[PDB]
Design a protein around this ligand. Sequence first.
Ligand SMILES: *[C@@H](O)[C@H](C[C@@H]1CCCNC1=O)NC(=O)[C@H](CC1CCCCC1)NC(=O)[C@@H](NC(=O)OCc1ccccc1)[C@@H](C)OC(C)(C)C
Ligand SMILES: *[C@@H](O)[C@H](C[C@@H]1CCCNC1=O)NC(=O)[C@H](CC1CCCCC1)NC(=O)[C@@H](NC(=O)OCc1ccccc1)[C@@H](C)OC(C)(C)C
Lengths: 306, 306
Amino acid sequence: SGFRKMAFPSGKVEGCMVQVTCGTTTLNGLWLDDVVYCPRHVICTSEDMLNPNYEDLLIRKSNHNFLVQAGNVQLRVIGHSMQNCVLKLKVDTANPKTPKYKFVRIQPGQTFSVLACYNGSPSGVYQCAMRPNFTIKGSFLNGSCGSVGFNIDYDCVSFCYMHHMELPTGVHAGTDLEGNFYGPFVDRQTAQAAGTDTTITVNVLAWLYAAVINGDRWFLNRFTTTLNDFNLVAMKYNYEPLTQDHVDILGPLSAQTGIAVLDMCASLKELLQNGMNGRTILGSALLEDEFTPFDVVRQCSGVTFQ
Amino acid sequence: SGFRKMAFPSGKVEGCMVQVTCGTTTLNGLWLDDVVYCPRHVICTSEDMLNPNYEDLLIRKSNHNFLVQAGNVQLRVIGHSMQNCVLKLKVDTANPKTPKYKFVRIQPGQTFSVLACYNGSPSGVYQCAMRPNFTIKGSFLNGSCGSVGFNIDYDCVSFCYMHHMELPTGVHAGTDLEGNFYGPFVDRQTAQAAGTDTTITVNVLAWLYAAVINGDRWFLNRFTTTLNDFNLVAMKYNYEPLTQDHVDILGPLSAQTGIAVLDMCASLKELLQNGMNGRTILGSALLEDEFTPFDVVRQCSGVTFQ
Ligand SMILES: *[C@@H](O)[C@H](C[C@@H]1CCCNC1=O)NC(=O)[C@H](CC1CCCCC1)NC(=O)[C@@H](NC(=O)OCc1ccccc1)[C@@H](C)OC(C)(C)C
Ligand SMILES: *[C@@H](O)[C@H](C[C@@H]1CCCNC1=O)NC(=O)[C@H](CC1CCCCC1)NC(=O)[C@@H](NC(=O)OCc1ccccc1)[C@@H](C)OC(C)(C)C
């Protein structure tokens, strides 16, 4: 019993974070085998963030310009190269704590965990999702860029996010580990905004199913509706359309609970259309959307890793 | 910018969790130097949870009844003993990954992090507080007992909680690491309940200060009130009294923000007395109480560990 925002154990990823310094800049990097990864605006100084040519600034630097410290031990760079918006520094030592790992690029609505870092030292770990506007509501301060996002699956570490920048509204933008940005953002200090966001409808239903598994139940009715008659009302409250494929993924949830998938839709239909009258689902007073169907089953049914 | 429920990196504690089996029972244990810790109702079978005499059941067992596995490696017990409600099994190997560590017993209103475990394998990590009724709203399933709660402070690991049982309402009860229960609960399967809870008033003000640091500001007024005139209204909404000592601990928050401590009290006074009219503080629609003044400053100002 109970339902919490839960994050994967962060031990395997702490064994990788290091510090990278060049000029007057210092940020976090990720050390795997004999390569350290970090954002490229670490070759930028404060004059190089208007509209820089990174290719031409990287021909200026030499290998000994990059200070890499892992613990109170200095790593020696021997080569360097550029892949999109990330930078790769080849060092002469291999990380003995390198886990089974794997770069993947995620799709909006999926969730991951974030280990925030400063000066190569982990500070804390929390759970996020990629919003439909391709940003993330993180907790980040100065020096945080270089932190990664990641999921664990049995024992493999799927790295999916490197952090780069905060936006005027306070949400956040970064890349996948192959250096490509999530969203239409670029790494030059000009004007940018996020674009209009929507609520992740499939996740909302998954949390509502979690509720019934835990005891809560004042929200189910006897009505049903059709898949098109749902989207008509979802349209208006700025939710995303729900698709036939989303329906299937909710099969084992509907199964174990007894509540048909289209039945729970007609329940959510009223909640949007009447508010909550001051009562709470799973401790919350809002309709919460940062829980996938995966997250519900791994937490309500007992799945660990190794 | 941004404000999230954050948990300490769990790496140092994953190096300790093991599995303990005896009879038909299996649960988690904590391995430090040459000692493994676990709850004593692991010598209990299913017949031994009505009203057992543990002292007299422990004279029955022999050292080879306790299977201890750390990884796919078997630990050999050589001795065993009882300290209140926890059980200590001395094994012939010392844990090489034993961190700087330290047992402490916490006070209601303080927060800690929990690494949930099953079969000696970590599953996930989240943030809790000790409620004023001495229980905790965790996320726990079968096999979870043996998980610990802990804070990190620079590089020392202060272990403060071992998990034992769920209560009819679904909150949770356990002990400190020296085996003493938080609360008036006992480890025998009879009737027990939690008692009436209150809201943690000092934490509510600390989260409200976090809000102002982040931009939110529609809740401050020009009124003030007195410390006694606050408790009069706190009394009625089932909040805890606020004391002169609590006031001091809010000094650096009030400082950096400019809002006097008694000024924020008069602001909270209205919020209780008018509701929120459908607007949200730090993404939330409720008044949130699981953030201490410590938690706010370490997150809003950049503190890590090593
Ligand atoms: C990594 O250490 C660091 C983290 C930032 C620091 C402030 C709080 N949160 C963070 O995540 N990232 C940076 O230092 C960014 C610098 C790069 C410059 C070249 C490539 C892009 C990022 N700085 C930022 O994150 C800034 N954001 C930004 O550039 O916004 C785009 C913009 C600019 C002007 C007008 C409109 C939009 C932040 C710190 O500055 C703002 C304006 C967001 C306060
Ligand atoms: C540790 O593996 C395990 C975890 C439990 C399992 C269910 C979900 N959540 C959990 O945390 N703990 C136990 O197995 C407990 C057994 C011990 C028995 C002797 C010493 C006390 C605990 N079991 C429980 O946690 C049970 N709780 C309980 O005993 O409640 C007290 C009570 C009993 C009868 C009437 C009133 C009060 C749970 C599983 O059973 C309930 C009744 C809560 C469903």
